[PDB]
Amino acid sequence: MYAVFQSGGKQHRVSEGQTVRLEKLDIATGETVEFAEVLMIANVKIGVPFVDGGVIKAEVVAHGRGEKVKIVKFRRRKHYRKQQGHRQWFTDVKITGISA
Amino acid sequence: ARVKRGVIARARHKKILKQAKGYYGARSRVYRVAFQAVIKAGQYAYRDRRQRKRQFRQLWIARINAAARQNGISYSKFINGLKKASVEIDRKILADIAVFDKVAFTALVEKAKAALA
Amino acid sequence: MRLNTLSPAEGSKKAGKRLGRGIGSGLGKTGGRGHKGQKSRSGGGVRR
Amino acid sequence: AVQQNKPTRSKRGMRRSHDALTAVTSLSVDKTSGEKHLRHHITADGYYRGRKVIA
Amino acid sequence: METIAKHRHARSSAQKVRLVADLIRGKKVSQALDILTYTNKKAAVLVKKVLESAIANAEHNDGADIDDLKVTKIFVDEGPSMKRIMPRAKGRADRILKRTSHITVVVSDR
Amino acid sequence: VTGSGKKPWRQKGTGRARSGSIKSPIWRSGGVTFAARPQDHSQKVNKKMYRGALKSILSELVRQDRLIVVEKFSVEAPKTKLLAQKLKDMALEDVLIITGELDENLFLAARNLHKVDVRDATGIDPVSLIAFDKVVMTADAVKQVEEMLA
Amino acid sequence: MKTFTAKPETVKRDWYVVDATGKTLGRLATELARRLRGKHKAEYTPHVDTGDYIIVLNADKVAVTGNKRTDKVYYHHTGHIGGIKQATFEEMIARRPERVIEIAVKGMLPKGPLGRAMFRKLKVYAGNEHNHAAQQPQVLDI
RNA sequence: GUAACGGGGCUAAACCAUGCACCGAAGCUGCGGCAGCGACGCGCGUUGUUGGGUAGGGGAGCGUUCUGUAAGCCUGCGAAGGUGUGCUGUGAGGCAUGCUGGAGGUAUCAGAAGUGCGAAUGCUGACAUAAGUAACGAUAAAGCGGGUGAAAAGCCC
RNA sequence: CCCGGCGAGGGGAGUGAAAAAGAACCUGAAACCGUGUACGUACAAGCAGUGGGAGCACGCUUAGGCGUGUGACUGCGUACC
Ligand SMILES: [K+]
Ligand SMILES: [K+]
Ligand SMILES: [K+]
Ligand SMILES: [K+]
Ligand SMILES: [K+]
Ligand SMILES: [K+]
Ligand SMILES: [K+]
Ligand SMILES: [K+]
Ligand SMILES: [Mg+2]
Ligand SMILES: [Mg+2]
Ligand SMILES: [Mg+2]
Ligand SMILES: [Mg+2]
Ligand SMILES: [Mg+2]
Ligand SMILES: [Mg+2]
Ligand SMILES: [Mg+2]
Ligand SMILES: [Mg+2]
Ligand SMILES: [Mg+2]
Ligand SMILES: [Mg+2]
Ligand SMILES: [Mg+2]
Ligand SMILES: [Mg+2]
Ligand SMILES: [Mg+2]
Ligand SMILES: [Mg+2]
Ligand SMILES: [Mg+2]
Ligand SMILES: [Mg+2]
Ligand SMILES: [Mg+2]
Ligand SMILES: [Mg+2]
Ligand SMILES: [Mg+2]
Ligand SMILES: [Mg+2]
Ligand SMILES: [Mg+2]
Ligand SMILES: [Mg+2]
Ligand SMILES: [Mg+2]
Ligand SMILES: [Mg+2]
Ligand SMILES: [Mg+2]
Ligand SMILES: [Mg+2]
Ligand SMILES: [Mg+2]
Ligand SMILES: [Mg+2]
Ligand SMILES: [Mg+2]
Ligand SMILES: [Mg+2]
Ligand SMILES: [Mg+2]
Ligand SMILES: [Mg+2]
Ligand SMILES: [Mg+2]
Ligand SMILES: [Mg+2]
Ligand SMILES: [Mg+2]
Ligand SMILES: [Mg+2]
Ligand SMILES: [Mg+2]
Ligand SMILES: [Mg+2]
Ligand SMILES: [Mg+2]
Ligand SMILES: [Mg+2]
Ligand SMILES: [Mg+2]
């Protein structure tokens, strides 16, 4: 069984027991989040746009920063160079139940 | 207050040469070349964080098109149908369903067909 | 009050310009002199 | 005429791919003295094909 | 039980000596000594003396038997170059490098 | 730099970077581009700013309980052992002692104690007031330091 | 999750047989190119050959519109100076009729190692017979 | 050398008209993050908006050597340096630690600069490349026996 | 003591806290040159990377994926001053 839900301006196809990395949620580790807008559940219920009664429950398992990305900007012959680092925050959630 | 540059200079050159590991010839060995190689690698990586989003969407669309045409509908009509059905499932998920759950993809096509007809 | 707990007043000690020390500085390469001409030159510039 | 670009260590290695020496495939054994020798050459003790030919 | 001999500062470029070293790498020492005997190279003479030294070291110091020994490792490193001046035409001087080599033979019964 | 002013090689034709002096700062063994000269690093301190700083320092020493005042500070003989014992009785170790006048015996007693300095009131300086953990002042020295600073 | 990729060692490639008789050259070629590349499969992966083996029969009976039978010219250069050679469609059909389809498909396949690998799965025959009954090709109508 | 559709190919996959889909950018939106400027409130929140840049102006920092703080602190139970590895910050960077090293190092807050290099046909040293290539310097010329020697075309007879 | 030309050079032994402090001697960077191992590479066209990515090898705590090395194939892509 799997469900499709929106979180962090992205969509995620998940089953129970899966750990899913999302954009940071302002929720503590251990705490339960509910994704009540569920686009699809296949055991096939297809939302228009959301499956009536569909909730995915999940435990927040961790917050953290992803791998460092280096931003290099360089304009050849124009005496311009700029570097920046980036680490994107994430929230890992473990899916606990799907229910239409 | 004379300052010798050796220790700091070494550290800087080593930092660049570490980033140039795996590069061919002078590009992994020689500072002058490795520095250019590392800058260019960074320019490309910047560009390709944008291109990656283009390339994956292009891949998903191609797969949705294949799967849609197996179910007797073009990509362009399929997407129009899902929009008229008010299905907001994005191309990443549709392309994944197209591969991994062909029956659910068939159900999406049937929903899309019903919306157009 | 010790010799390692005295600070100058804020704004009293601005750092000097150091020309010709790389792109980041904003004064690299030409050192704020622009490109060529008499005013770019060492000892260059017209009298009062 | 001279190179416009320094040839690589790779290219140097590739040119030298034909420089390897060939070992003597086998040494012959004199039928009398039992000495190893180059085939069709006399032994170091001056035998050839069982006969003491030099001294 | 590996036993080494080296000829350090041998008067030959490493390139020239390496041609000979490649013939005997991995061979049994009896086969190696035969190969070197019928290799018509100055380097064969140099490498053979180092191999004979390594064998003698293995027998005397390490209590080996020649019949068990193989050339387990052999390599030639670049030694110090002697710098010399070659007079060329029109008063121009060239540097001659008289290249030297460090020859290392390792013999073992494993 | 010691050397000739001879141009190392001709301006044109040799294929080398143009040279003018063997003493060029670009060159090994050449001059230093902006060779240091002996400098006077002394700054002016306005009289009033000096005196103002001393008053601020002295006032902080009082607020921090680092200024101790005595009626008298003396040792009998010019003997380091006497001063060392006198100081450890007072719970002192690192101390500027400021007296009304230069006394021979206290000066000589303090000389081999690195943590201890003995001044007259005239020879106070702002660094020493801050540097030493405590400052002992004779009552006479206080009178003179007040007279100094007004 | 990461998007699926086909794996070359696990790809299922089916065998098909197409009759070229009376088909418009270019309109057949695009459908061949599509299927050789595997663009018809949901498992389509740009860097993997996911396509099918395709037998084309009756290549000599492929059709072209207009005056192309006489006027479509195939050029190649031999690499020797002045060595520009030409053949009309009708001459190509007479001499080497499989080449007409093969050339049409090759130009519609990706360039590079993978595109060349994709082309190897196309088996063009001048006539109505093939040697590949062992591969059990299914009829594919275009 | 096709060579005046980018190619294949196309009789539409051309052109015209009409219409609806879809693709398509670092544009716009979504989600997360950072910073500038300004409000409105109490350096914090909320909210608006801005953040492509050469010359160039303005602002804020990193690190290096040296002076004080320091007769302190760390260090033979292993300093600096060297070399890996891991962690960490928006960046210059920082921290930790394995190995090497074998005696120095130096927080903090201040102070001073021989304070940062890829270019200057830069300067010095080292080391490459061409390359085991050209060449081995008069085309008067060598051959053999014997000797000596670890070895002899070249030395001795 | 041993190999070697009563060599050069080396291997042992011994000294020393250390000889990978052995006199070409403190530390011992880099270019440059090797030996070994893993992976790739002999139908393949270009600034040699970057984005995607299979396979293989070696390690690891869902027994799982993960990490490290490599990088077939593929989109994009003409160094720096
Ligand atoms: K200026
Ligand atoms: K001089
Ligand atoms: K004293
Ligand atoms: K260390
Ligand atoms: K300090
Ligand atoms: K230079
Ligand atoms: K060479
Ligand atoms: K690529
Ligand atoms: Mg110094
Ligand atoms: Mg390296
Ligand atoms: Mg500027
Ligand atoms: Mg200029
Ligand atoms: Mg101008
Ligand atoms: Mg100007
Ligand atoms: Mg001048
Ligand atoms: Mg050129
Ligand atoms: Mg060769
Ligand atoms: Mg002359
Ligand atoms: Mg000097
Ligand atoms: Mg005065
Ligand atoms: Mg292309
Ligand atoms: Mg022509
Ligand atoms: Mg986009
Ligand atoms: Mg935007
Ligand atoms: Mg903008
Ligand atoms: Mg800007
Ligand atoms: Mg200091
Ligand atoms: Mg400088
Ligand atoms: Mg340099
Ligand atoms: Mg520059
Ligand atoms: Mg040279
Ligand atoms: Mg030769
Ligand atoms: Mg040549
Ligand atoms: Mg030749
Ligand atoms: Mg010749
Ligand atoms: Mg001669
Ligand atoms: Mg000799
Ligand atoms: Mg003779
Ligand atoms: Mg002669
Ligand atoms: Mg004679
Ligand atoms: Mg000796
Ligand atoms: Mg050591
Ligand atoms: Mg010496
Ligand atoms: Mg020492
Ligand atoms: Mg040393
Ligand atoms: Mg081919
Ligand atoms: Mg191949
Ligand atoms: Mg090529
Ligand atoms: Mg390209």
From Swiss-Prot, chain B:
Q: Which GO terms describe its molecular function?
A: large ribosomal subunit rRNA binding; mRNA binding; mRNA regulatory element binding translation repressor activity; structural constituent of ribosome
Q: Sorted alphabetically, which PROSITE patterns does this protein's record hold?
A: RIBOSOMAL_L20
Please give the superkingdom of this protein's source: Bacteria
Q: Which Gene3D superfamilies match?
A: 6.10.160.10, Ribosomal protein L20
Q: Which InterPro entries match?
A: Ribosomal_bL20 (IPR005813), RIBOSOMAL_L20_CS (IPR049946), Ribosomal_protein_bL20_C (IPR035566)
What GO cellular component is one of the record's annotations? cytosol
Q: Which cysteines are joined by disulfide bonds?
A: none
| Keywords, alphabetical | Ribonucleoprotein, Ribosomal protein, RNA-binding, rRNA-binding
Q: Give yes or no: UniProt keyword rRNA-binding.
A: yes
User: Example GO biological process term?
Assistant: cytoplasmic translation
Quote the CDD domains the UniProt record gives: Ribosomal_L20
Write out the function statement from the record. Answer: One of the primary rRNA binding proteins, it binds close to the 5'-end of the 23S rRNA. It is important during the early stages of 50S assembly.
| Family in the record | Belongs to the bacterial ribosomal protein bL20 family.
Annotated NCBIfam families: rplT_bact
| Subunit structure and binding partners | Part of the 50S ribosomal subunit. Contacts L21.
Alphabetical list of HAMAP family matching this protein: Ribosomal_bL20 (MF_00382)
Q: What is this protein called?
A: Large ribosomal subunit protein bL20
Source organism of this protein record: Escherichia coli (strain K12)
Identify the coding gene.
rplT
From Swiss-Prot, chain D:
HAMAP family reported for this sequence = Ribosomal_bL32
Residue segments, region Disordered: 1-37
What's in the keyword line of the UniProt record?
Answer: Ribonucleoprotein, Ribosomal protein
* Record note on quaternary structure: Part of the 50S ribosomal subunit. Contacts L17.
Protein's UniProt name: Large ribosomal subunit protein bL32
Source species, domain of life:
Bacteria
Does the keyword field hold Heme?
Answer: no
State the similarity comment. Belongs to the bacterial ribosomal protein bL32 family.
Q: Which GO terms describe its molecular function?
A: structural constituent of ribosome
Q: Does the keyword Ribosomal protein apply?
A: yes
Organism equals Escherichia coli (strain K12)
Q: Which InterPro entries match?
A: Ribosomal_bL32 (IPR002677), Ribosomal_bL32_bact (IPR044957), Ribosomal_zn-bd (IPR011332)
GO BP: any one term: cytoplasmic translation
Coiled-coil positions: none
A Gene Ontology cellular component where this protein is annotated is: cytosolic large ribosomal subunit
UniProtKB/Swiss-Prot annotation, chain E:
Zinc as UniProt keyword? no
The effect of A93 to S/T/V is: Abolishes translation elongation arrest of SecM
What task does this protein carry out? This protein binds specifically to 23S rRNA; its binding is stimulated by other ribosomal proteins, e.g. uL4, bL17, and bL20. It is important during the early stages of 50S assembly. It makes multiple contacts with different domains of the 23S rRNA in the assembled 50S subunit and ribosome.
Which InterPro entries does the record associate with it? Ribosomal_uL22, Ribosomal_uL22_bac/chlpt-type, Ribosomal_uL22_bac/org-type, Ribosomal_uL22_CS, Ribosomal_uL22_sf
Entry-linked NCBIfam families: rplV_bact
Output the Gene Ontology terms for molecular function. large ribosomal subunit rRNA binding; structural constituent of ribosome
Look up and give the organism this protein is from: Escherichia coli (strain K12)
Record-level GO BP terms: assembly of large subunit precursor of preribosome; cytoplasmic translation; cytosolic ribosome assembly; response to antibiotic; ribosome assembly; translation
Q: Which key words are in the record?
A: Antibiotic resistance, Ribonucleoprotein, Ribosomal protein, RNA-binding, rRNA-binding
User: Hey, which family's this protein in?
Assistant: Belongs to the universal ribosomal protein uL22 family.
Q: How does it assemble?
A: Part of the 50S ribosomal subunit. In TnaC-stalled ribosomes forms part of the binding pocket for L-Trp with the leader peptide and uL4.
Keyword Methyltransferase applies: no
Q: Where does L-tryptophan bind?
A: K90
- Please, what other remarks does the record include? The wild-type allele (erythromycin sensitive) is dominant over the resistant allele, and is also dominant over the temperature-sensitive allele at both low and high temperatures.
Q: Which SUPFAM superfamilies match?
A: Ribosomal protein L22
This protein is called what?
Answer: Large ribosomal subunit protein uL22
**Superkingdom field:** Bacteria
From Swiss-Prot, chain F:
Stretch list, region Disordered: 1-20
GO biological process, alphabetically ordered: cytoplasmic translation; DNA-templated transcription termination; negative regulation of cytoplasmic translation; negative regulation of DNA-templated transcription; negative regulation of translation; response to antibiotic; ribosome assembly; transcriptional attenuation
Instruction: Give one GO molecular function term.
Output: structural constituent of ribosome
Instruction: List UniProt keywords, sorted A-Z.
Output: Antibiotic resistance, Repressor, Ribonucleoprotein, Ribosomal protein, RNA-binding, rRNA-binding, Transcription, Transcription regulation, Transcription termination, Translation regulation
Gene Ontology CC: one annotated term: large ribosomal subunit
Q: Name the domain of life this protein comes from.
A: Bacteria
Q: tRNA-binding: present as a keyword of the record?
A: no
Consequence of changing V116D: Does not regulate the S10 operon in vivo
Mutation: T80I; reported impact is: Does not regulate the S10 operon; assembles into ribosomes in vivo
Q: List the disulfide bonds.
A: none
Per the similarity annotation, which family is this? Belongs to the universal ribosomal protein uL4 family.
**Note, other:** The erythromycin sensitive allele is dominant over the resistant allele.
* Subunit relationships: Part of the 50S ribosomal subunit. In TnaC-stalled ribosomes forms part of the binding pocket for L-Trp with the leader peptide and uL22.
- The protein in question is named Large ribosomal subunit protein uL4
What does the record give as the organism's lineage?
A: Bacteria, Pseudomonadati, Pseudomonadota, Gammaproteobacteria, Enterobacterales
Relative to the complete UniProt sequence, the shown stretch is: 52 to 201 of 201
